[PDB]
Amino acid sequence: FCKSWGAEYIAADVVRFRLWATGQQKVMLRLAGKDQEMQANGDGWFTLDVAGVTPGTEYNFVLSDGMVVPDPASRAQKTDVNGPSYVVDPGSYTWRNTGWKGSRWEQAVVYEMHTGTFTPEGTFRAAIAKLPYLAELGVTVIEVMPVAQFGGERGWGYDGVLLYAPHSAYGTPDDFKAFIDAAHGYGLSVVLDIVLNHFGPEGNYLPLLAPAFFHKERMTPWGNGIAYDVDAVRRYIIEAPLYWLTEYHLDGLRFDAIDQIEDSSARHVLVEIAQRIREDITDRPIHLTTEDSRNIISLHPRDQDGNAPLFTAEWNDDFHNAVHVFATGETQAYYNDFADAPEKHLARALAEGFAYQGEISPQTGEPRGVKSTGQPPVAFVDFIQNHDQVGNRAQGDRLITLAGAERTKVLLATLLLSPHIPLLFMGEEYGESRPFLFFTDFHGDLARAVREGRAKEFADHAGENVPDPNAPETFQRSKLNWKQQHSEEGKAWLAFTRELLLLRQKHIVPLLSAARESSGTVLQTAPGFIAVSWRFPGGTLSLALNISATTVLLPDLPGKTLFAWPNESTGSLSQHSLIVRLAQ
């Protein structure tokens, strides 16, 4: 992929190095230790063409004063975020599965994976050995947490600063391509979590190169707001997703915190990103998902034939959040919006998409959301676990530890047989109980600021003892336990998950393509009990769930029984049970 920023081959034997640095009068290129002056070619841009440069050659930029910095648009770092960048050959990796052309979004079952903790080794190469396992299980889309190089050698990925460079701790560019290529061969699409709303705190020299890269007033909760209205900035931001998709042959992207991407440009940066992706990549579906707290739908339209010209689906945190209150009784902070009749919110989310479609949010005191019933069910990504819902907790508790195994089983089945697109957090499939903690790898003042900034999020829970994010044990405690995965109890969870996914592809997925609207109805709710129906062209799907300690009577649920757990009862649902039916 060809980019405005960075180091690219412009001929078989010539690399063009390009940097925008409005805060600088001059910039030098330090190439394999030797300094050459770059040409200032208007509007703060500096450029230099160098003949003969081989792939793997190290380089840095040197500022007017003598400060040595990584390429902010580095394609790869030699070691850490502050060290040399290196010239990458886009063609060094030989793609084997070039006939892959993806799969329809309707069959998506997403599996969110953190590269560093997914395996003991914590690398892309080690993760390849687990791909057959995931494919066998019935996962169809791997979502890789952000790989943009960040400070230190451990982190979730949201402190990324070199937005074009996969973290050297995970592997080289070719290691990541090998993982993607292998995934394709195993029948898995791969999407990447991408952060375009802020830069992390270590290794970001853009403020020193070009203060205008960031706004003077605007600040997100995690760093300065980005000046998307400035042409050079817009090039850096928009070309990043295009680069990842083209150069890494990815199947989509998940955009972090889009509600924190403020742009007053006539054409919003996110709209332009989506439009360019749909015009530039046409040989395969590209599944663009977004994380937005606003419960809008304007970025997820469908045309009459069901195509998504902008974004494909939206993270529907209302589902998780209603489930969490419903199943655990916790009502603090953002969960308080679901404290009143969580069953009603849950049923509404299942049936219609959003629980909040314009009603006042208790937590904000403002209207939240818009009508969502006209969206197809596949425009929502639902989940009972993800990196945030687990990791934003002081002790990183997984749902199974809060709701218990029996309740978690019926919630997992609910998720997997529902018409919304399901996302699983790595480890759920075998009943993992290890926490997923917030971990980092910083030093000095930054380490202290991050550690105390984290503790302060839980200061009102006085009694808490938040694990130091910088401590290696915080990271080690979060590693998936593959022993458990191989255990008998783990094999029971795996068998449960596997059957659910088979049932999903056999019975649910075929209903989804023709569904142009929610088509969902709440039949009944009561404390601990929901019953919902979806009327699709291909059949009427019904679901009822009871997590109360006593049996409940059911409405009529037409059709044959797709799944009943633990048992099926006629006209009733026992404690801690679920039933799913389909009438055709």
Q: Which residues are catalytic?
A: 256, 291
Q: Is 409 in the site for Cl ion (CB under 5 A)?
A: no
Q: Which is nearer to Cl ion, 313 or 399 (CB)?
A: 399
Tell me if 429 is assigned to a ligand binding site.
no
Of these partners, Cl ion, Mg ion, none, which one is at the site of residue 292 (CB under 5 to 8 Å by kind)?
Mg ion
Of these partners, Mg ion, Cl ion, none, which one is at the site of residue 90 (CB under 5 to 8 Å by kind)?
none
Q: Is 104 in the site for Cl ion (CB under 5 A)?
A: yes
Contact 183, 115 (CB under 8 A): no
Structure tokens at 428: 């759920």
Q: Which is nearer to Mg ion, 292 or 432 (CB)?
A: 292
Q: Which pairing describes strands 214-220 and 189-194: parallel, antiparallel, or unpaired?
A: unpaired
Tell me if 556 is assigned to a ligand binding site.
no
The nearest distance, CB 104 to Mg ion, in angstroms, is 6
The nearest distance, CB 176 to Mg ion, in angstroms, is 18
Residue numbers 323-362 binding Cl ion by CB under 5 A:
none
The nearest distance, CB 320 to Cl ion, in angstroms, is 9
Residues that bind Mg ion (CB under 5 A): 91, 257, 292-293, 306, 314-315, 366
Q: Is 412 in the site for Cl ion (CB under 5 A)?
A: no
Q: Is 368 in the site for Cl ion (CB under 5 A)?
A: no
Of these partners, Mg ion, Cl ion, none, which one is at the site of residue 279 (CB under 5 to 8 Å by kind)?
none
DSSP 8-state class, residue 73? T
Q: Which is nearer to Cl ion, 476 or 513 (CB)?
A: 513
Of these partners, Mg ion, Cl ion, none, which one is at the site of residue 398 (CB under 5 to 8 Å by kind)?
Cl ion
DSSP 8-state class, residue 335? G
The three-point CA angle 466-469-474 to 5° equals 85
Of these partners, Mg ion, Cl ion, none, which one is at the site of residue 400 (CB under 5 to 8 Å by kind)?
Cl ion
Of 347, 357, 372, 345, the closest CA to residue 524 belongs to 347
Q: Is 105 in the site for Cl ion (CB under 5 A)?
A: yes
**DSSP result, 283-317:** SS--EEEE--SS---TTS---TTS--SS-SEEE-H
Q: Is 398 in the site for Cl ion (CB under 5 A)?
A: yes
Of 261, 256, 42, the closest CA to residue 159 belongs to 256
The nearest distance, CB 198 to Mg ion, in angstroms, is 12
Q: Which pairing describes strands 380-382 and 421-425: parallel, antiparallel, or unpaired?
A: parallel
Of these partners, Mg ion, Cl ion, none, which one is at the site of residue 170 (CB under 5 to 8 Å by kind)?
none
Q: Is 237 in the site for Cl ion (CB under 5 A)?
A: no
Of these partners, Cl ion, Mg ion, none, which one is at the site of residue 366 (CB under 5 to 8 Å by kind)?
Mg ion
Tell me if 292 is assigned to a ligand binding site.
yes
Q: Is 313 in the site for Cl ion (CB under 5 A)?
A: no
The distance of Cα 2 from the centroid of its chain, to the nearest Å, equals: 25
Of these partners, Mg ion, Cl ion, none, which one is at the site of residue 83 (CB under 5 to 8 Å by kind)?
none
Structure tokens at 254: 């998940």
DSSP 8-state class, residue 146? P
Q: Which is nearer to Cl ion, 64 or 363 (CB)?
A: 363
Q: Which is nearer to Mg ion, 54 or 551 (CB)?
A: 54
Q: Which is nearer to Cl ion, 94 or 307 (CB)?
A: 307
Contact 262, 226 (CB under 8 A): no
CA dihedral 8, 9, 10, 13 (to 10 degrees): 150
The nearest distance, CB 573 to Mg ion, in angstroms, is 30
* Listed ranges 84-92, 349-357, 362-370, 399-407: which one lies at the site for Cl ion (CB under 5 A): 399-407
* Listed ranges 287-295, 350-358, 455-463, 491-499: which one lies at the site for Cl ion (CB under 5 A): 287-295
Structure tokens at 558: 């037409």
Of 425, 420, 341, the closest CA to residue 379 belongs to 420
Q: Is 533 in the site for Cl ion (CB under 5 A)?
A: no
Tell me if 352 is assigned to a ligand binding site.
no
- Of 399, 426, 554, 562, which one interacts with Cl ion (CB under 5 A)? 399
Phi–psi pair at 425, nearest 5 degrees: -90, 135
* AA identity, residue 278: R
Q: Which is nearer to Cl ion, 166 or 422 (CB)?
A: 422
Round to whole Å and give the CA distance between 64 and 24. 6
- Nearest residue to Mg ion, using CB? 91
The nearest distance, CB 141 to Cl ion, in angstroms, is 11
Spell out the long-range contacts of 355-358 with Cβ–Cβ below 8 A and sequence spacing 24 or more: 355/318, 355/319, 355/321, 355/322, 356/295, 356/318, 357/295
Structure tokens at 229: 């209205």
Q: Is 285 in the site for Cl ion (CB under 5 A)?
A: yes
SS3 content of the chain, % helix, strand, coil (to 5): 30, 25, 45
**Residue 71 CB neighbours (<10 A):** 26
The nearest distance, CB 255 to Cl ion, in angstroms, is 14
The nearest distance, CB 91 to Mg ion, in angstroms, is 3
Round to whole Å and give the CA distance between 339 and 331. 5
For residue 489, give every residue at least 6 positions away whose Cβ sits within 8 Å of its Cβ, in sequence order, or none: 431
Contact 79, 58 (CB under 8 A): no
Q: Which is nearer to Mg ion, 306 or 374 (CB)?
A: 306
**Residue 296 CB neighbours (<10 A):** 17
Q: Which residues bind Cl ion (CB under 5 A)?
A: 104-105, 285-286, 293, 317, 398-400
Q: Residues forming the annotated binding site for Mg(2+)?
A: 292, 314-315, 366
Binding-site residues, in ranges, read 292, 314-315, 366
